[PDB]
From a paper:
RAD51C is an enigmatic predisposition gene for breast, ovarian, and prostate cancer. RAD51C is a central member of the RAD51 paralog family of proteins that share sequence homology to RAD51, the recombinase during homology-directed DNA double-strand break repair (HDR), and with incompletely understood functions in this pathway downstream of the classical cancer susceptibility genes BRCA1/26. RAD51C binds XRCC3 (CX3) to form a heterodimer, and separately with RAD51B to combine with the RAD51D-XRCC2 dimer into a hetero-tetramer (BCDX2), whereby all paralogs except RAD51B are considered essential for cellular survival. Yet, recently RAD51C replication functions distinct from HDR functions were described, including replication fork protection, fork restart and fork reversal.
Numbering used by the authors:
A (entry chain A): 84 to 283, 289 to 357
B (entry chain B): 5 to 261, 268 to 345
Write the structure that this text describes.
Amino acid sequence: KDERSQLSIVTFSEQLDQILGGGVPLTKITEICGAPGVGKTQLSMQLSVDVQIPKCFGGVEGQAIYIDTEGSFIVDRVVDIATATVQHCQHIASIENNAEQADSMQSLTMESILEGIHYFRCHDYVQLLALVHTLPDFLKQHPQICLIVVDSIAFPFRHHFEDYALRTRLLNGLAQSFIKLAVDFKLAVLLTNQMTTKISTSHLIPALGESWGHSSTIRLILYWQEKSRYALLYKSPSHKQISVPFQITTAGIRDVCPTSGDLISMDVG
Amino acid sequence: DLNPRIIYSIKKAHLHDYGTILSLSAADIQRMTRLSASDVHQLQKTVAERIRRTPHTTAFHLHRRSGPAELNRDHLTTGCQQLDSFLRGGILTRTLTEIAGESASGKTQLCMQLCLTVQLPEQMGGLGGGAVYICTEDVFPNKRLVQMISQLKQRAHDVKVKDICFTDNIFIEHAAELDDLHYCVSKKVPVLLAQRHVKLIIIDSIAALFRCEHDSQSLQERARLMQLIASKLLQLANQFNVPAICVNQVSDVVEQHRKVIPTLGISWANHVTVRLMLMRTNYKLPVQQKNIEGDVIGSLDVQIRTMEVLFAPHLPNSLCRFIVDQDGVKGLPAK
Ligand SMILES: Nc1ncnc2c1ncn2[C@@H]1O[C@H](COP(=O)(O)OP(=O)(O)O)[C@@H](O)[C@H]1O
Ligand SMILES: Nc1ncnc2c1ncn2[C@@H]1O[C@H](COP(=O)(O)OP(=O)(O)O)[C@@H](O)[C@H]1O
Ligand code: BEF
Ligand code: BEF
């Protein structure tokens, strides 16, 4: 309805922003799946930075919540991405020569970007439910928050749950909780997910079973092909099935060439 | 647990574990007890607030580093400045670092070197504590360790390092089978972390114990024991602020029918924070042998080896050369 509910968070890869519909959409759930090292945490860090891009540079100019359940949030890496994002905005302000942009760069620093990343560390799945349930009290106090990252949603639930049906309603309780948070506070919910195998040539599938992923609007699979990273659009409202190449540099998520990359694939129909 | 008045329904409702409460909906609470959304909301609010959890902070605090102390990590030096910069500081605490590599690639040498550097004072890049080395394969190479210790004391020009008794603070355990390794990690190691100030956990090798069972009932059991051992390792690393390092044989010839693939599969990989791979090359480096009071006498060849970052949250997929000599593992300047 309002103009905030239709905004999107850029990934700094335009090829990625295409298949996402302009970026990671607010008020929806976006899911990132992939083998280790493919870039789930890299994309999570990038979005936590990109959501803070000021509106005079075309950004949402919000803040981020980073819920880290694996412990792979090394702040020295975020400094890399934050530095590069500020340098990119500084470049725009210099090319476009607008006075408001030059004013934004006065307060747009790597440190301010770090200050816009609210960080929560969960060690077990019980701490995650306790945090999600106390989030409304926190978000009402920080209404400028436009992004919630859970990195990852899968890791706390890989234990030997004796009642997998209990794990299922645990995951669906969270999926309903994140959908409600996404609409009620008009922020993007980014969930990262691990891959697992299936025996009954073994192949990889997203974790948490077939009961998981229904409440996710967009689902991406990051994967390697030769020595190149790719993002397969697994689930989307457009129903199209696309793969786009991207890369991960010291600056963060970027397009592989400026510019290059396109495939087609689809489903019935 | 908190107030007894709302309790009259949940004690009678067969649900007194704090974790189980937070799963179901407020209307489902009304389904189980004759309570209102006013009570169902306040019931789950107090439970969620009761659960102890590390408090909120910002990335800026992590950078400063002025948030909760249990979120700070420390760097353990590799002993070489060149490898330390390649790792942006060295081995990180509260992480699981996997060191994979082919046979005689230097995996054991590197781990033994960290058993020395962990004992250095923090000003020198150490963590000021001992190490536990869990062996599943060969006998520990004590002759090689004593050589490295002597070379370290000889080359250190500070009495603070010379007066360290390295052998007394390196605790060698042998785990013959997968179940025994789980006992050692879950029961033996925490004693060392608490009572003897061990600041480094090494397992060499977790993959070797996956030798030959091949019973699916065991294979479910083999994978069940992996998750438990890997989860316990991560839990100890965070709780005691120590690095956990697992050595793994990279299984080359079957997967690649010079390219390589680590052994334990994707379920194991999902626990690894940083995975490095060591390989041998055919190239050799001429180095002058000079000893101490005697002088440079001639050149000998050392094997040139590679170290590669397969994945890490903060490192590029870079490669770096290194060698092994009397002192241990030494990096080579780029490039
Ligand atoms: N400082 C850096 N410079 C360049 N690339 C990096 C840097 N840090 C990490 N990367 C890339 O990102 C990868 C880590 O991705 P990550 O998101 O942690 O994986 P996962 O999807 O398992 O979370 C590394 O393997 C590396 O290729
Ligand atoms: N004192 C030394 N000087 C030079 N090279 C050594 C020394 N000790 C061992 N090496 C080399 O290290 C390799 C063995 O390394 P090791 O730690 O056993 O690796 P891995 O555990 O992967 O077999 C051998 O190739 C050997 O040539
Ligand atoms: F660091 Be990634 F989320 F595996
Ligand atoms: F000595 Be090595 F770990 F094979």
